[PDB]
Amino acid sequence: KSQINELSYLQVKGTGLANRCAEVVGEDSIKPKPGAKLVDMCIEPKAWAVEEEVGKAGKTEKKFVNSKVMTRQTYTLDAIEGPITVDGGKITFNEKEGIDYAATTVQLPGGERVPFLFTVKDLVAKGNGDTFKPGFQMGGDFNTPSYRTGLFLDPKGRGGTTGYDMAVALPALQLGEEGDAELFGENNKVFDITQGRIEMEVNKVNAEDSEIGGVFVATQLSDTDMGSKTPKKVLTKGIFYAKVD
Amino acid sequence: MTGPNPNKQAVELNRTSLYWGLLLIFVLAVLFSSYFFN
Amino acid sequence: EVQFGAYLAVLLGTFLPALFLVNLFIQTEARKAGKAGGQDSD
Amino acid sequence: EVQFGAYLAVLLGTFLPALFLVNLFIQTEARKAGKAGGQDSD
Amino acid sequence: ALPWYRVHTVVLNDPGRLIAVHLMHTALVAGWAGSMALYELAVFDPSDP
Amino acid sequence: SEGLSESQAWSRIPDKLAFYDYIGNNPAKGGLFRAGPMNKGDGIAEAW
Amino acid sequence: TEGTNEWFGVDDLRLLAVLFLGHWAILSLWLGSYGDSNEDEDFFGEIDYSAR
Amino acid sequence: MEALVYTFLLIGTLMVIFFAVFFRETPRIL
Amino acid sequence: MEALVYTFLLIGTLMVIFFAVFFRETPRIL
Amino acid sequence: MLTLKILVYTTVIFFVSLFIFGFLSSDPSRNPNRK
Ligand code: CLA
Ligand code: CLA
Ligand code: CLA
Ligand code: CLA
Ligand SMILES: CCCCCCCCCCCCCCCC(=O)OC[C@H](COP(=O)(O)OC[C@@H](O)CO)OC(=O)CCCCCCCCCCCCCCC
Ligand SMILES: CC1=C(/C=C/C(C)=C/C=C/C(C)=C/C=C/C=C(C)/C=C/C=C(C)/C=C/C2=C(C)CCCC2(C)C)C(C)(C)CCC1
């Protein structure tokens, strides 16, 4: 936005403006060139829901339960860029660089904390049509990397590419032919890459600034903790902004 | 603090009552232990 | 396999009411010794 | 999982030495009440 | 020389200490109700109603 | 009566209603020294 | 917003109102003993034992 | 392990019976 | 379940401190 | 949140002003020698 660029760093810091997306003014149309490229795509989640079996009035349907963020204002992706490829009919976007991941922890009713890497990493997003419109819909799959890298050590000093490979505080478990096979899933730290799905939807286009902006809805899986727990499905909604060039 | 209380009495338990109560608590413990342990 | 809370229920259910009665008997004899007036009263 | 005998070791290790000292204090006050000679001596 | 089963009759004609002895029963009953509910919340599983 | 099969009729029964029709939820089926929750007896119920 | 540079943490004027009203309330009690006190009454000690 | 509790309660009951008989308060006249 | 024992021991210790302060034997001269 | 902030600000300025005007309440004279 032009308003945010008018401010100093000292006027913004502490206020929480730096975690917000820019709002776009106007309904116009942008037709992307062959060398077109989204540059500073901001993606701000504003709602978080984790799927869990709930006991509503008499049955046990699956519901996305609204959850509260506890990692305070670190969740918004920004500076996402990548070329806009014009196909025969449709317009596609392949994100390449930028801060395209944000570790977020939400808390479920009951005290259950659900960490997840909110990401758009390796997003290939197919659109409908050839120009950016106030009814344009872009969407596609992305790759969710594992929330912990293989360098992450657990409380007992075990990790994927570093660490102990045994429960080292229980040395008598390494005895007999079976060994520590009952503790294999906790000693074997596995880097897992899952898939997520985001559906963006442009509703405001500023042609003089070459800026688009609308809403999205994304679903992905949460942290598996190196393959030690079963991940939960996390549904998120919010606002995005981008500049088209 | 108000005055010294004039209702203050002494408490007694003679040796017979001690043996009767020690027997009662041990026998109730003997009786009910098998049920508590289940 | 027996219930593990029953070890607490039996042993505290024995000892605490038994030591209450041992407490009551001992202070009865100490009160008689104090009123007797000799060598045990102090 | 914790050791199940520790519930006995902590709770009898608390209550039985505490009730021994409560026993000693109460008979000290009862012996003073018997020697005092009035309404609490009997 | 009260017997053990008559020890609480010392507040029979002491209305100030009868109030005090009823406030202590009230403290123990309310303290039971607060701590029984805290124990029950520590072991309740509110996931499948 | 409204044109459903036997399998479709019985799938409409809520599991909360079927759980009440089970003798382990009878309060006159316990014991004086069988201590603890009802889940300590038969387990935690999972599925009809 | 906690890292922003507000006077006494006052970001809403509710907080300014309760700071005044809280401080003026004990002031008004304190003026019940030390209002109507003469300004020209001095002393030449290290400590004054004037009145109540 | 509960037979340790069962033995201690029975032997403890017999020790009370021993002290109730041989350490009894002797009935005295006058 | 052992946190019940840990809480009871700490709260029981603070109750002794309460009675040691407010139900103390008052030091008296003569 | 901001209702709690009113309550804490009211509470802190209450006890701080008791501290301030109490030590302004001729506090050196409150000694057992005189007054
Ligand atoms: C910020 C809020 C505030 C508060 C809390 C007060 C408080 C007070 N002002 Mg006020 N004042 C204020 C702002 C405030 N002022 C403002 C903005 C103005 C306009 C500028 C004034 C203008 C003003 C004037 C002109 C005067 C006061 C006076 C007073 C005092 C009343 C006199 C008294 O002590 O009799 C008692 C007051 C009562 C209301 C009766 C209360 C009775 C209770 C029960 C206590 C009685 C004792 C009881 C037996 C046992 C105690 C228990 C109890 C404390 C719980 C009182 C301390 C008078 C004063 O300070 O004299 C020098 C006075 O003359 N005020
Ligand atoms: C609100 C009900 C209530 C109240 C205020 C009283 C009050 C009294 N009773 Mg009565 N009584 C009651 C109900 C009540 N009783 C009930 C339900 C029964 C049938 C069990 C009796 C049968 C009875 C008899 C036979 C006698 C009394 C006596 C007394 C007096 C002295 C009690 C004493 O010093 O024992 C002191 C108690 C102890 C030292 C320890 C007792 C330990 C018990 C047996 C087990 C532990 C109790 C447990 C901690 C509490 C569980 C809570 C539960 C009650 C909800 C006192 C006026 C006596 C009397 O008349 O005095 C002249 C007397 O001889 N009561
Ligand atoms: C009105 C009284 C009352 C009732 C109806 C209940 C009911 C319940 N309690 Mg609660 N509870 C109570 C008071 C009560 N409580 C009190 C006063 C305490 C503090 C001591 C507790 C502390 C407590 C805990 C920690 C737990 C319960 C639990 C339960 C549930 C399971 C019951 C069970 O399995 O018992 C088992 C059966 C018995 C205990 C038998 C009763 C005693 C028999 C009649 C013998 C009588 C005593 C005997 C004569 C003396 C022994 C002799 C001695 C010398 C050894 C049930 C809903 C459990 C639960 O499910 O929570 C989630 C549980 O874990 N209760
Ligand atoms: C000696 C100990 C002491 C201390 C530490 C305090 C501390 C405080 N008092 Mg003070 N107070 C005291 C004694 C004390 N008081 C005494 C003895 C009196 C006389 C009875 C007062 C009368 C008093 C009043 C009436 C007020 C305070 C306020 C305050 C707070 C000021 C907030 C601040 O610093 O912003 C710094 C403030 C500024 C930078 C602005 C002031 C500068 C202005 C622009 C200059 C203008 C001068 C003057 C205000 C107007 C001219 C007219 C005047 C000469 C008649 C602070 C908590 C006030 C408050 O803010 O409550 C929250 C308030 O309204 N006090
Ligand atoms: C958390 C706190 C929990 C508190 C619980 C602790 C308090 C519980 C203990 C109190 C009970 C005391 C009973 C004392 C016992 C005792 O004091 O008796 C003596 C007593 C008679 O007392 P007197 O009037 O002679 O007075 C003498 C006085 O010194 C007594 O204080 O009798 C009674 O109390 C009534 C009859 C009870 C009779 C008891 C017999 C029991 C039968 C035994 C069954 C066993 C054999 C069976 C084999 C089949
Ligand atoms: C033992 C113990 C404890 C405790 C502690 C303590 C001891 C406390 C105390 C406390 C206290 C010590 C309290 C008090 C209270 C008080 C009050 C609460 C008061 C009030 C007051 C007021 C309110 C006033 C008013 C006024 C007036 C009257 C006039 C002038 C003005 C004014 C307004 C100021 C604990 C917990 C640690 C635990 C351990 C043990």
Instruction: Quickly tell me which residue has 């003469």 as its tokens.
Output: G38
In DSSP notation, F4-25 reads --HHHHHHTS-HHHHHHSSGGG
For residue J8, how far is the Cα from the chain centroid? Answer: 15
Structure-derived torsion over alpha carbons of residues C5, C8, C11, C12, reported in degrees to the nearest 10: -140
Tell me whether chains D and G touch (3+ CB pairs under 8 A): no
Closest residue by Cα to residue B35 from C5, D33, A136, I16: C5
Which chain D residues are closer than 8 Å to B4 by Cβ?
A: none
* CA distance between the termini of chain I: 52
Rounded to the nearest 5°, which phi and psi values hold at A235? -100, 130
Rounded to the nearest 5°, which phi and psi values hold at B6? -80, -5
Rounded to the nearest 5°, which phi and psi values hold at A203? -130, -10
Chain E residue closest in CA terms to B5: E14
SS3 A180: coil
SS3 A231: coil
* Distance between G20 CA and the closest CA of chain A, angstroms: 26
Whether the CB-CB separation of A75 and A45 falls below 8 Å is answered with: yes
Residue G24 CA to ligand 4 center (angstroms) comes to: 10
Structure-derived torsion over alpha carbons of residues E3, E6, E10, E15, reported in degrees to the nearest 10: 180
Return the sign of the alpha-carbon dihedral for residues E35, E39, E44, E46. Answer: positive
d(CA B7, CA B4): 9
d(CA B29, CA B20): 14
Closest residue by Cα to residue J23 from A30, G26, A194: G26
Whether the CB-CB separation of A51 and A240 falls below 8 Å is answered with: no
* Distance between F31 CA and the closest CA of chain B, angstroms: 11
For A127, C8, E31, E32, F46, the CA distances from E39, given in Å and listed in that order, are 55, 18, 12, 10, 25
State whether B7 and E11 contact (CB < 8 Å). yes
* CA distance between the termini of chain F: 24
Whether the CB-CB separation of F38 and F25 falls below 8 Å is answered with: yes
Whether the CB-CB separation of F19 and F25 falls below 8 Å is answered with: yes
State whether C28 and B22 contact (CB < 8 Å). no
* Elucidation method: cryo-EM
Backbone dihedral region of D39: left (phi > 0), alpha (psi from -120 to 50 degrees) or beta?
A: left
Is any ligand 3 atom within 6 A of the Cβ of residue B23?
Answer: no
Whether the CB-CB separation of J12 and G24 falls below 8 Å is answered with: no
For A80, B6, G2, the CA distances from E12, given in Å and listed in that order, are 82, 12, 61
**DSSP 8-state code for residue F40:** H
Protein residue closest via CA to atom 59 of ligand 3: F36
d(CA H9, CA B28): 10
d(CA F18, CA A160): 47
Which chain D residues are closer than 8 Å to C16 by Cβ?
A: 15, 19
d(CA A57, CA F17): 12
Which chain A residues are closer than 8 Å to F14 by Cβ?
A: 58-59
* Distance between A102 CA and the closest CA of chain E, angstroms: 29
d(CA A79, CA A40): 4
Both tokens assigned to B12: 């007694």
Q: What b/e sequence results for A108-122 when a residue is b if at least 16 CB atoms lie within 10 Å of its CB, and e otherwise? A: beeeeebbbbbbbbb
Q: Which residues pair with A102 in a beta bridge?
A: A118
Whether the CB-CB separation of A79 and A91 falls below 8 Å is answered with: no
Closest residue by Cα to residue A53 from F39, E45, F17: E45
For B23, G9, H22, I3, the CA distances from J18, given in Å and listed in that order, are 63, 21, 71, 41
Residue A178 CA to ligand 3 center (angstroms) comes to: 44
Provide the edge-to-edge strand list for the sheet that holds A101-107.
A68-69, A101-107, A113-119
Q: What is the largest CA-CA distance in chain F?
A: 50
d(CA I6, CA E1): 40
d(CA B31, CA A190): 57
d(CA A236, CA A59): 25
d(CA J20, CA A89): 77
d(CA B11, CA D29): 12
Residue A47 CA to ligand 5 center (angstroms) comes to: 67
Residue list, annotated binding site of E for chlorophyll a: 7-8, 22, 25
d(CA A165, CA E44): 36
What ranges in A94-138 are assigned the alpha helix state H?
Answer: none
- Residue type at position J33: N
Residues 6+ apart with CB under 8 A from A105: A69, A70, A71, A113, A114, A115, A116
d(CA F11, CA F5): 10
Instruction: Quickly tell me which residue has 């018997």 as its tokens.
Output: D34
Q: What b/e sequence results for G20-30 when a residue is b if at least 16 CB atoms lie within 10 Å of its CB, and e otherwise? A: eebbeebbeeb
Closest residue by Cα to residue C19 from E1, D25, D27, D23: D23
Tell me whether chains E and A touch (3+ CB pairs under 8 A): yes
Whether the CB-CB separation of B9 and E2 falls below 8 Å is answered with: yes
Of C2, C6, C25, the CB nearest to B18: C25
Helix and strand numbers (H, E) in chain A are 3, 13
Closest residue by Cα to residue B5 from E4, E17, D31: E17
In DSSP notation, C1-42 reads ---THHHHHHHHHHHHHHHHHHHHHHHHHHHHHHHH-SSS--
Both tokens assigned to A1: 């936005």
**DSSP 8-state code for residue A24:** P
For A106, A165, C24, the CA distances from A223, given in Å and listed in that order, are 11, 21, 62
Nearest ligand 1 atom to the CA of G29 is 57
For A53, A151, A192, E41, G41, the CA distances from A227, given in Å and listed in that order, are 22, 15, 7, 31, 82
**DSSP 8-state code for residue A187:** H
Residue G22 CA to ligand 6 center (angstroms) comes to: 19
Run of H or E including A141: strand A137-144
Q: Which residues pair with A85 in a beta bridge?
A: A92
Closest residue by Cα to residue A98 from A72, A80, A117: A80
Interface test with C, best of B33, B34, B38 (most C CBs within 10 A): B33
Backbone dihedral region of A225: left (phi > 0), alpha (psi from -120 to 50 degrees) or beta?
A: left
Of C22, C30, C42, the CB nearest to D30: C30
- Proximal ligand: closest to the CA of G32: 1
Q: What b/e sequence results for A125-161 when a residue is b if at least 16 CB atoms lie within 10 Å of its CB, and e otherwise? A: bebeeeebbbebebbbebebebbbeeebebeeebbbe
Whether the CB-CB separation of A65 and A85 falls below 8 Å is answered with: no
Q: How many CB atoms lie within 10 A of CB J16?
A: 14
Rounded to the nearest 5°, which phi and psi values hold at A151? -80, -10
d(CA A119, CA A196): 8
Q: What b/e sequence results for B5-38 when a residue is b if at least 16 CB atoms lie within 10 Å of its CB, and e otherwise? A: eeeeebbbbbbebbbebbeebbeebbeebeebbe
Q: Chain I within 8 Å of D7 (Cβ-Cβ)?
A: yes
What ranges in chain A are assigned the alpha helix state H?
Answer: 2-5, 9-12, 184-187
For A219, D32, E5, E16, F12, the CA distances from E10, given in Å and listed in that order, are 72, 20, 12, 11, 67
Instruction: Quickly tell me which residue has 């009953």 as its tokens.
Output: E29
With 0-12 CB in 10 A as exposed, 13-18 as middle and 19+ as buried, what is D30? buried
d(CA A75, CA A51): 19
Closest residue by Cα to residue A196 from A103, A108, A124: A124
Residues 6+ apart with CB under 8 A from A26: A204, A205, A206, A207
Structure-derived torsion over alpha carbons of residues A146, A149, A150, A154, reported in degrees to the nearest 10: -100
Q: How many CB atoms lie within 10 A of CB A39?
A: 16
Run of H or E including E22: helix E15-43
Q: At what angle do helices H2-22 and B15-37 cross, to 10 degrees?
A: 160
SS3 D19: helix
d(CA E9, CA E1): 12
d(CA C24, CA G35): 64
Nearest ligand 5 atom to the CA of B12 is 29
Closest residue by Cα to residue A90 from A139, A29, A152: A139
Q: How many CB atoms lie within 10 A of CB D41?
A: 16
SS3 A212: strand
d(CA F31, CA A4): 71
Closest residue by Cα to residue A241 from A11, A34, A16, A76: A76
Interface test with C, best of B9, B13, B26 (most C CBs within 10 A): B13
Residues 6+ apart with CB under 8 A from J13: G18, G19, G22, G23
Q: How many CB atoms lie within 10 A of CB A3?
A: 9
* Distance between B18 CA and the closest CA of chain D, angstroms: 15
Of B16, B19, B30, the CB nearest to H9: B30
Whether the CB-CB separation of A224 and A230 falls below 8 Å is answered with: yes
Residues 6+ apart with CB under 8 A from H25: B14, B15, B16
SS3 D37: coil
For residue G22, how far is the Cα from the chain centroid? Answer: 9
Both tokens assigned to D29: 């006050």
d(CA C23, CA D30): 11
- Residue type at position C13: G
Both tokens assigned to A69: 């963020």
Residue B17 CA to ligand 5 center (angstroms) comes to: 6
d(CA G18, CA G41): 35
